[PDB]
Design a protein around this ligand. Structure first.
Ligand SMILES: Nc1nc2c(ncn2[C@@H]2O[C@H](COP(=O)(O)OP(=O)(O)O)[C@@H](O)[C@H]2O)c(=O)[nH]1
Ligand SMILES: COc1cc(S(=O)(=O)Oc2ccc3[nH]c(C)cc3c2)cc(OC)c1OC
Ligand SMILES: [Ca+2]
Ligand SMILES: [Mg+2]
Lengths: 69, 423
């Protein structure tokens, strides 16, 4: 009976510690996944905008080509 | 000197225990300070059974007050006879059991049980001949139910050759605090079956009905219910606390009342039911005593048979007439007593009556009809457990469903054992 009493209080501690561990890992995963996703969206937006600057630096390149002809 | 160590656990156990010490201190002429101010020396012949004598002719109860909350024990210390208990014997926690058997028995009470046993050991070491322990508690809460049974299990480990006695209050939907009371009661009953020698089954359903139907109280309070408990506890300890030609001790009661070790749950009864100037005759005491309306266990005796019966009459009366009326009950309703236990009814008479009564009688019955009480608890247990309702309160404390299933099986087995001796 004393052995069972130890096992019950040890099981209660294990399940409370596991609950704290599961929450800490779940939150760490979500915050890391969110940071990667949001950065990837901002990087994609800047990629399109920086590509537009490449197209702008190229349109001006065509006019300088034809004005000297 | 045959000393008894008293233990009270939980809200119900301490409130009922405090009233018990209040009642018997008056009967022995002990004031709230702890000094004797009586007249008859019969009040002190066996005062050592429940009291320890201190310096200056001071009498201190051999009581240990246990709770996981400080609230109820602060009320006792501020109560009428609060100053009579040892300050060292107040062992209490702070978190509480939350009406949870697991918290009392496994998690929260485990942190406190060792300190309680130190007080139990301190009291037992100073006993010339310790005959056993008596515990007052309820089975529907968490502290008296959970920790109380844990205390009983650990006390038996350290004192296996001593008598374990309990005054156990059964839960009832009529007077209910939480819906998980059947869970707590079923878990406690399995503990009591294995680890107690005598259990006085005090049913809150019976106490409510007596206050309502008989005493004519529309809204009974716990004080009203505890008044009945005080009268019963005083009656069932009369032979212990007062001299007689019987030399009554706990072990003798267990040997004669318990024909099979698991069937040690007694139906207490009292007469006259009080809440008042007319004296009661001996035939009236005997008729009310065996009346179901005076039973504290909410069971119909006519639905079962009496294995053994112990009756205590208090007051100045004709012992010749007492034997007439007791024999009249047996010879009349002989179908309600087992014929295979000859002379299974014992009668003792004490000249000192309780406070406020000229004549009183106390009934202690080991009836197989007590299975109705365990059937009632079992049915309320199963209705919830089949749907696993409220189980998370217990599994969150480390318990498993299997432990509940085992307790349910032991509960139903006890009913089966009581049933076979009814034929
Ligand atoms: N007769 C009686 N029953 C009580 C009293 N207090 C609580 N109860 C019963 O005991 C159960 C509640 O247990 P409680 O003592 O409060 O739990 P604990 O303090 O954690 O041990 C319920 O079924 C109540 O009906 C009381 O003073 N007298
Ligand atoms: C501590 O409580 C009591 C103890 C005793 S006893 O020590 O004499 O035990 C006996 C002896 C012979 C018996 N025959 C039967 C059928 C029961 C029985 C019990 C008697 C009591 O009242 C009758 C008690 O009630 C207050
Ligand atoms: Ca703690
Ligand atoms: Mg309570």
């Amino acid at each position: 009976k004393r052995e069972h009493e130890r096992e019950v209080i040890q099981k209660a501690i294990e399940e409370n510690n596991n609950f704290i561990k599961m929450a800490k890992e779940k939150l760490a995963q979500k915050m890391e996944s969110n940071k990667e996703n949001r950065e990837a969206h901002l990087a994609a937006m800047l990629e399109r905008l920086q590509e537009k600057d490449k197209h702008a630096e190229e349109v001006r390149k065509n006019k300088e080509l034809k004005e000297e002809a | 000197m045959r000393e008894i160590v008293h233990i009270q656990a939980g809200q119900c156990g301490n409130q009922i225990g405090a009233k018990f010490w209040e009642v018997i201190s008056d009967e022995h002429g002990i004031d709230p300070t702890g000094s004797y101010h009586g007249d008859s020396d019969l009040q002190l012949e066996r005062i050592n059974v429940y009291y320890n004598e201190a310096t200056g002719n001071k009498y201190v109860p051999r009581a240990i007050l246990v709770d996981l909350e400080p609230g109820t024990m602060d009320s006792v210390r501020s109560g009428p006879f609060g100053q009579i208990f040892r300050p060292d014997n107040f062992v209490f926690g702070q978190s509480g059991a939350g009406n949870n058997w697991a918290k009392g028995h496994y998690t929260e009470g485990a942190e406190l049980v060792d300190s309680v046993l130190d007080v139990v050991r301190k009291e037992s070491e100073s006993c010339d001949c310790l005959q056993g322990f008596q515990l007052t508690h309820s089975l529907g809460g968490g502290t008296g139910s959970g920790m109380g049974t844990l205390l009983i299990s650990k006390i038996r480990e350290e004192y296996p050759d001593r008598i374990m006695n309990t005054f156990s209050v059964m839960p009832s939907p009529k007077v209910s605090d939480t819906v998980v009371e059947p869970y707590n009661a079923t878990l406690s009953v399995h503990q009591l079956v294995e680890n107690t020698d005598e259990t006085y089954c005090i049913d809150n359903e019976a106490l409510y009905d007596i206050c309502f139907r008989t005493l004519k109280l529309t809204t009974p309070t716990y004080g009203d219910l505890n008044h009945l408990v005080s009268a019963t506890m005083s009656g069932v300890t009369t032979c212990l606390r007062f001299p007689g030609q019987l030399n009554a001790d706990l072990r003798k009661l267990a040997v004669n009342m318990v024909p099979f070790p698991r069937l040690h749950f007694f139906m207490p009864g009292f007469a006259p039911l009080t809440s008042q100037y007319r004296a009661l005759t001996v035939p009236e005491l005997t008729q009310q005593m065996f009346d179901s309306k005076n039973m504290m266990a909410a069971c119909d005796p006519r639905h079962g048979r009496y294995l053994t019966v112990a009756a205590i009459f208090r007051g100045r009366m004709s012992m010749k007439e007492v034997d007439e009326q007791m024999l009249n009950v047996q010879n009349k309703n002989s179908s309600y007593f087992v014929e295979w236990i000859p002379n299974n009814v014992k009668t003792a008479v004490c000249d000192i009556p309780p406070r406020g009564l000229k004549m009183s009688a106390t009934f202690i019955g080991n009836s197989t009809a007590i299975q109705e009480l365990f059937k009632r608890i079992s049915e309320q247990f199963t209705a919830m457990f089949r749907r696993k309702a409220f189980l998370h309160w217990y599994t969150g404390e480390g318990m498993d469903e299997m432990e509940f299933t085992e307790a349910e099986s032991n509960m139903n087995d006890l009913v089966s054992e009581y049933q076979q001796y009814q034929d």
